[PDB]
Amino acid sequence: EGKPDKLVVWENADDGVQLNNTKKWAGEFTKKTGIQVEVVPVALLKQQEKLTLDGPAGKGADLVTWPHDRLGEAVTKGLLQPIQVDNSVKNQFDDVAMKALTYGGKLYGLPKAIESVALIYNKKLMGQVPATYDELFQYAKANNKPDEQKYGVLFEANNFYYTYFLFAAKGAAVFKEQDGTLDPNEIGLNSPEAVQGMNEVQKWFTEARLPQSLKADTVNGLFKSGKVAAVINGPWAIKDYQAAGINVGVAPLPKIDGKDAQTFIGVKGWYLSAYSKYPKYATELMQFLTSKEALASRFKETGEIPPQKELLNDPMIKNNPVVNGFAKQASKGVPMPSIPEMGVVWEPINNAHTFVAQGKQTPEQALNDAVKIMKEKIQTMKQ
Numbered sequence: 001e002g003k004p005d006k007l008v009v010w011e012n013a014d015d016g017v018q019l020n021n022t023k024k025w026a027g028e029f030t031k032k033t034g035i036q037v038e039v040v041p042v043a044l045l046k047q048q049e050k051l052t053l054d055g056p057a058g059k060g061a062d063l064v065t066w067p068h069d070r071l072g073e074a075v076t077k078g079l080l081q082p083i084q085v086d087n088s089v090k091n092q093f094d095d096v097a098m099k100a101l102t103y104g105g106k107l108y109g110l111p112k113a114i115e116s117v118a119l120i121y122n123k124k125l126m127g128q129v130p131a132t133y134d135e136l137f138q139y140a141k142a143n144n145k146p147d148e149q150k151y152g153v154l155f156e157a158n159n160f161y162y163t164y165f166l167f168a169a170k171g172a173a174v175f176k177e178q179d180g181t182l183d184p185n186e187i188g189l190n191s192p193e194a195v196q197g198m199n200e201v202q203k204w205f206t207e208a209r210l211p212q213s214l215k216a217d218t219v220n221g222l223f224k225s226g227k228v229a230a231v232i233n234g235p236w237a238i239k240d241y242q243a244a245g246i247n248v249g250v251a252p253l254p255k256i257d258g259k260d261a262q263t264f265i266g267v268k269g270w271y272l273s274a275y276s277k278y279p280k281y282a283t284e285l286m287q288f289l290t291s292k293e294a295l296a297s298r299f300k301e302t303g304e305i306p307p308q309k310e311l312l313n314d315p316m317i318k319n320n321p322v323v324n325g326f327a328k329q330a331s332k333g334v335p336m337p338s339i340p341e342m343g344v345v346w347e348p349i350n351n352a353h354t355f356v357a358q359g360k361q362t363p364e365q366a367l368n369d370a371v372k373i374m375k376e377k378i379q380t381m382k383q
């Protein structure tokens, strides 16, 4: 008496390819095992906050997903539990991706996607990509006409995730480096070099005339409308652009100060809620959703590159010029930090970008204020 064996999965609310693909494969798991699986759309960046509330209340999903940067935060808050999988299961995936989903020596997920932003261009507007960043920036300055919705280069310049390469080019770092990624609280986001990076961000709004209070929808919408020659964005945008009829090209970001652009690398995995009533069955589902066959289908539908060893060297991924551009850029990037203190960085740093873009605060004042705030919030991350 009482046998409603039902699992809940939260997938990104893209009202599209990512949601459908998971609905597909969860249904195949139901067909195989008899276990009912409900795939519910919840925005990628809202999932961790939602589980924080709903999880302890018994209303959270069994499987959840978000980029790995906030793993340490999630693990320290007790949102997630380490997963029980065989060595052979782990061996199917790329080591960088597995490392990103590991915290304190414990594995917290199986990867679905590995990603970096690159230069995505309209081939009908841009035949050849600029050789350097200075050339890209001049092209932007010469062609960005916000008085007609036409742009040469447009991207989320008010977002640190996107602007990181500007900071990295100047020698700036999220956390200072000294043998290992584990950084106690040495934030480097208001170093002289970090101000240099934020100086470059300012230039995109002053010289290149980028719109105020930017968001993804503005960037994507204007590109899909054929009004933008090039954007800086990730593999997650490709299907949307192609369905909008854009003949898309993808190239690594043009060299900045003569060096490879150091973009963030992101890993998206399935995680297992610490409040799941069925961790055994949910982990079985997690393995099913990240199998070679499942992830090959996921790439075809969603365009997101699966960090599965064999698939990474599969022709549809390694020998696809569009996918190749992202892969090359990611090879020059750095994984986002995943230590708990990373869960204090994003809001103040993005706020700093906004103050700079809106001409309300200087790069120095914005970043100094931001790091002060970060340090303050970290002093409450303990028992």
Ligand SMILES: OC[C@H]1O[C@@H]2O[C@H]3[C@H](O)[C@@H](O)[C@@H](O[C@H]4[C@H](O)[C@@H](O)[C@@H](O[C@H]5[C@H](O)[C@@H](O)[C@@H](O[C@H]6[C@H](O)[C@@H](O)[C@@H](O[C@H]7[C@H](O)[C@@H](O)[C@@H](O[C@H]8[C@H](O)[C@@H](O)[C@@H](O[C@H]1[C@H](O)[C@H]2O)O[C@@H]8CO)O[C@@H]7CO)O[C@@H]6CO)O[C@@H]5CO)O[C@@H]4CO)O[C@@H]3CO
Residues within 6 Å of the ligand: 012, 013, 014, 043, 044, 045, 046, 067, 068, 069, 070, 115, 159, 160, 161, 215, 216, 217, 234, 236, 266, 346, 347, 350
């Ligand atoms: O189609 C585009 C996109 O649109 C939808 O997302 C919108 C969302 O639904 C809105 O709610 C709003 O989001 C705000 C959010 O709700 C607020 O809480 C806050 O967000 C904070 C985060 O919660 C917090 O986690 C952190 O976020 C940082 C990440 O942790 C970090 O990993 C990185 O994020 C980047 C991702 O790593 C990367 O994958 C890439 O994301 C793309 C998606 O993968 C792709 O599917 C698609 O997403 C849809 C989405 O499904 C809709 O629901 O496009 C994405 C790129 O546009 O890019 C990420 C960076 O954007 O960096 C972030 C910090 O930027 O900190 C934040 C800030 O405190 O603020 C949110 C914004 O106001 O807006 C989004 C529209 O983007």
